[PDB]
Symmetry: D2
Subunit: 484 residues, 4 copies
């Protein structure tokens, strides 16, 4: 039906929380009121002592990602099952063209894989893995016709996706022109390449070689450069998987001066540290490898959450990019061949809850901002997503702030046989998830429908562009020309 009535709980939006019953009809919220009588035949859910949160939005997923002939184990079906079991009802995945491949053809491939499989709504960012006139031209079609308002370039990955300062400059101008946000994987690629060469030459072949090849100052430098270029163009920039203190500090520094930069920590960075790469077990060590690496500095995750609470970091993704032991073992004598990526789609919200709320770092409202509402505004799908209000989509999570769980591979819903949050006790979990007025997770069991989810288009010139027309006006250099 997509029709359900949720009674006796507390609604929590990012502006306030309050006691109210919520009615969803034909997948849309119809009524919010202190007491809604159940009519004949309507399904009723009890949220006594529980919270109604807008469904989580995961801004950073890589389901079913092709890599070196193999593929990520978590795909669009299993992946979205895991999402809703953890309170996340919307994922944004990355289209990743091969070099010289058309973005439209790559986009077509991605949307076909998803449309068939998704158990919840989704949308897509497009990575700019190579640059040319035709690429520039296909960006316009994506934005105008294919519901895209976000593009991603890489400062890392020399000899493949890496772009230069001159290219990045022009990519950002094109983003500006089309009203798209510009995303950046920000590490100094030339130095990551020299550091990989150095570590392997020293015989440091294990996963720990990964962190040592790329310390956090290379992430902070590249973050700095990408913001300086973006501020010159005068267009919104978005730093994906901000993993380090240094890079977080850079973002805070520039934001303070009024620069239009957004930042995205991820569940791994908020939940674990990089000392697992020094584990004597190779399998365990290699399982935590991703890029940028999870940082071994112990104060890292707390500081990332501090910035998150302040709004100097905006929203939490996962970078969900999962590979099995056998796939990971491709790099057993060479850390550079370990497929990069960890899990998080299922556990993001409970990890954010445990490390943010239960530490006193985040209030309930700041948790909703950090996990749905701000993402929605940034990618221009608010208030359809990320808000419990009349007219908005009936995607809702019944959250129990008092139920405990220890996270383990033995009980997760990922297709991969390892979890980086193994043994971590959390208090506060999703006990029922509702997508389009339908229960898809409840009583510790999934009731998904494969291919239920829909693609959601994202118009250009959203909130991230508010103020920029005026900024362009006041920064006009003709205002500063001397008439001689």
């Amino acid at each position: 039906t997509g029709t359900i009535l949720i009674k006796n709980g507390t609604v929590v939006n990012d502006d306030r929380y309050f006691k109210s019953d919520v009615l969803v009809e034909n997948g849309i919220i119809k009524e919010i009121s202190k007491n809604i009588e159940p009519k004949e035949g309507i399904k009723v859910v009890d949220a006594t002592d529980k919270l109604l949160l807008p469904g989580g939005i995961d801004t950073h997923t890589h389901f079913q990602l092709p890599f070196m002939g193999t593929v990520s184990v978590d795909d669009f079906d299993i992946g979205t099952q895991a999402a809703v079991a953890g309170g996340t009802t919307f994922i944004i995945d990355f289209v990743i063209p091969t070099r010289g491949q058309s973005l439209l053809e790559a986009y077509d491939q991605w949307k076909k894989w998803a449309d068939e499989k998704v158990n919840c709504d989704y949308s897509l960012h497009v990575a700019i893995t190579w640059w040319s006139e035709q690429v520039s031209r296909e960006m316009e079609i994506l934005v105008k016709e294919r519901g895209v308002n976000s593009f991603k370039c890489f400062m890392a990955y020399k000899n493949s996706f890496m772009v230069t300062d001159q290219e990045m400059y022009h990519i950002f101008k094109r983003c500006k022109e089309l009203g798209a946000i510009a995303q950046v994987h920000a590490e100094n690629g030339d130095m990551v390449f020299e550091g990989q060469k150095k570590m392997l030459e020293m015989g440091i072949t294990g996963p720990e070689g990964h962190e040592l090849s790329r310390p956090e100052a290379l992430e902070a430098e590249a973050t700095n450069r990408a913001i300086v270029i973006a501020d010159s163009v005068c267009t919104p920039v978005y730093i994906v998987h901000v993993q380090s203190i240094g890079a977080a500090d850079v973002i805070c520094k520039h934001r303070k001066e009024g620069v239009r930069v957004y930042g995205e920590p991820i569940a791994a960075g908020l939940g674990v540290d990089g000392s697992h790469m020094w584990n004597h077990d190779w399998r365990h060590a290699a399982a935590f490898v991703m890029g940028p690496p999870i940082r071994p500095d112990p104060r890292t995750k707390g500081v990332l959450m501090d910035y998150l609470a302040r709004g100097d970091l905006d929203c939490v993704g996962t970078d969900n990019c999962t590979f099995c032991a056998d796939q990971k073992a491709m790099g057993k004598d060479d850390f550079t061949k370990i497929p990069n990526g960890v899990n998080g789609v299922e556990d993001r919200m409970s990890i954010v809850w445990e490390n943010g709320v239960n530490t006193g770092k985040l209030t309930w409202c700041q948790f909703v901002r950090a996990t749905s509402s701000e993402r929605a505004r940034i990618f221009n799908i608010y208030p359809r997503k990320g808000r419990i209000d009349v007219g908005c989509d009936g995607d809702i999570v019944i959250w129990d702030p008092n139920q405990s769980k220890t996270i383990s591979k033995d009980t997760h819903h990922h297709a991969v046989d390892f979890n980086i949050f193994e043994g971590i006790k959390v208090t506060g979990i999703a006990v029922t998830t509702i997508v389009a007025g339908n229960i898809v997770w409840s009583d510790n069991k999934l009731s998904c429908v494969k291919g239920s989810g829909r693609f959601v288009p994202r118009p250009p010139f959203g909130p991230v562009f508010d103020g920029i027309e005026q900024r362009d006006k006041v920064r006009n250099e003709l205002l500063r020309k001397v008439d001689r």
Copy 2:
């Protein structure tokens, strides 16, 4: 009637803006919709090309303040007329007991003056000008019975209102216990007193002696100390009239580490600099005198707005405390006897607009946050105030972002014969103000009703206390006792 229909404009809340018509019935918003047909006999206002903002909330007013036998010239009637002519539909004024005077008796006096005169809704903070057991006891009655959730102590004014560290500690614990926010006038009082003695001893008697007697480092030091004490108690603190870079930086520093501190710049600090105290005309110079002083550092107001945009400063007050030339002239041979205070209730919003929006520093939504919605949440009157939503109070401002005006005493609605924003050109003004569904400002004319406004109670344990129970839990020192 308190019933009105506003058509063809854009609603602007602090989360998003959108095209919609707004219907107000019996003083409450009834319907928000893209097209509302006017019924028979209903008054219709056109907001074509205009914005519908929640009425401004001024957190810091001193209408009709007794001082040295005389009184502030702007009172509760004329004062609230000026407010609505500038888009402000809610003021919070300070009850100021004399030393040894009952707070309840002082509160009774204040509410009587206001109830008779106000043209818009209001509420009241209570200053703690002296400390004792009975004071502590009357705070409970105020909070429980008299609708107060905010108390103010002074670190300045030696030999009168000043409190010591030990007193401030206990006042904040009492605030914590009652669920009230703790406000602070933060200057080092002992040093302000020695600096006044020094300046006058040097023969520096003019208004410029005022700034020199109290440079900004005394404000920053006292701000620092008040937050450290408040963080130890673990209770929300609120820094009133943050006038300086140094004090703003201190607040940012502590907030970053997760300290629960709020800050309030004022219209004067956002709109002018303290170089007017060096004006060769004594009258002009003395007219800008207030405490803390307006700062002569030119980069001050821009930096205050930067912090405001970031949310490191929360909301804008006025410290509206107006005196005429004759009153100001009491201190003609002694700056210490110049009655302290300037205007701003009328011009706050246009000044914030001109310096925030038209500089590119603030978006439209961040302007609403800075002028209504955040104040409302902080003082626990959201979403009744500071939001255009169904069920909320029909206090609305029709804002024209494109109409210009030069501010002058020759056209203002203050009772005082001087304006600190004289000659300042602003673009973006309130063209119609609506309080409780009734037009009170339109077509450049007032149509107020004296004593129309109501007192609005403010429950304790509002948003400013979210997270604190958990913080108390995790900071519990018994968790850190060694069992020997």
Copy 3:
């Protein structure tokens, strides 16, 4: 004789290091040259592969301190033996008047205790434990007649030594007038008192209660306030035992803006952390108690050394204030009655060496600055002390950067039966110490002469006052008076 020739070593001053032989005659350096032939009968020391450093200067000692009827176990004889065994040839101790006691009478007592006992040269600071006209007057005699140029006030110790803002202001003006540096024990005394009351009321009686009663934000706040007051007066201020990151950051902040503030970390803060106060053994825990406490934040000592290397902290003292197990046990049911103080006079230099040099944090020259030369300039006894140059005092340490040692009570030369640096392995120690051309430590044995050491007077208006006359000129507020 006080005559000795040191051959084959490297001289290390704070400006450069170089190979040279050093000749000392009648206690003064006579010649520095690449090759000095030994004459008939002259004693020769070999420093092949070793360094010649200026004798260490310990700016902060409390030998033989009266406390609650008992006395510190390390006195002026045993204490100075321990100093030279560790490479320190000059101590500055604090005269501490009782409240209402004459400073001159207290000074007389101190100098009598020392003159009889010291094995190396010394001098004395005077604490201002109470304030009055007569105190102000005795400060002038001390500075003019008794060789003192440094005075100390307390912001902590409510109901005893604590001074208010108004008193501190006037004490600093008096210091300014007399050309003395103003030292400050910087903790918020009112809050330390409320925190002690709170901890004991919770039943947290052990040493860990000490840290919890006084977290580092109370040190940082008081440091901040003391510098703001000192900058207003325009006179040099010196922060003793800077134990925390927060307080170090405050000093860096102000110094950057050009404020005349100096800071003194101590060997304990550079060498250990406060987690020893949570030791399950009461004796061990209580042994690390001092004020301000050693901080449990693990990154503390590294950050203190970073600032030291930068010159944002100037020189290292010890706060050597030692008590035996039996004395410590006075506070067995009450941490507030544990006599405050730890050891360090012997181990300061090796601890600074191990944590500064061997970490790569300090060069050899920066080590000499941090342990002698900067102290000497600050307290105006340079280049007589803290430099190997012709004409300078023949106090020299033969340092072996390659000899290792584990520090222990079983081998130290302190009179106390406990060492806070127990079990710490250091590489780089003093192997021979020379005071006034005489060997007092060599071949792991003492050869001191009791009462050999002399009192060294310290003229007012030293280096710490360079620039201040010009600062007073440019800050003259009459330059900013408006002529009306």
Copy 4:
């Protein structure tokens, strides 16, 4: 003779100042003593009420620089005359190979031009304008045979000298290996190129187009990147002409964490602001053009001096690169063709004095550090240069802190017919300069000898490399390899 006796003045070194007479014999300081009797026939100079400073060292000169077929107007003869008239007795100039030209052949050319012309001692840095195996190989000969210990690469000048991150990495490793300091012209070259294209396309052809083409964030970004790369290699880096607040802040940030970075402000940055590029007169505007540009932010020069005083910036150069009106006019319709460079060799010290000492920002000793002694240590020519001590070179400046002068082209000793410090009143000037015991400036007149000056070689592995062997040890990544 090179023999002179200076009586009645105060010696000022960077560690202390003191009254003493100084005797120079055969060009070397022979005796320093409170009273030196003049023998028969010895020349005596009176420095009653005056200061004896070590001769100024200018680390950054471009005398006689070939540019676009023309040459800088100040050459090695006239240039060194101007230097000594301003108290500077040592210049370090840059050898600048054309692309594909041998460094040795370029070095040979430079040394030939200088040896014939210099009136005071000099030495040479070598710019790395292109990178190859042979270049790498010629660096070794320069360091081992030709007395060079400093090399310079460019991050600006796309399509000519610019180097990439990968090249810069390898250049710094080569510097490390040879014990040379690595200098960096730090602006983002790709962005400077796009900004030049943009400004000219907008029709902004005047000198103001220069600043607008290259705001300070491009200097701060490139400064940041060069330090991150240098810190990874673990070798000393030196930022030349630090012109901006942003870039100064970056250096402070990294230095704090212990990074081995040095910074060089220049006299123009310390003395004037970039608002002269907006002068309505084209000639005046174009005369202030250099790269990076002088910054129009008014608080710039004060903040640069603050950092200088702190030692976060080390020493002052000039970037003396002078062109006449006719040469400047090459870019009359195109700011990109204006030959870049301003004057400063003559006025550096008085400008530093006026803005540093007379503001209260620098003491006398910190002025000597900033103008000679620190440069000498950094480029490894201390204490031969930058110190008044026995054995050191008899290059001395008699400084009058009380003599005033207004700077003008009508009285300077530059060959160019314009001065950027025109009309600036300074108090404190060089009244007599002495090079190698000979008077070369006195009684407002030059008495130089052309080709008197000598080339001074600079050994590798100087002070800038102290600590680095230990840093390499502790940073060894093999210490962090997991043994599996």
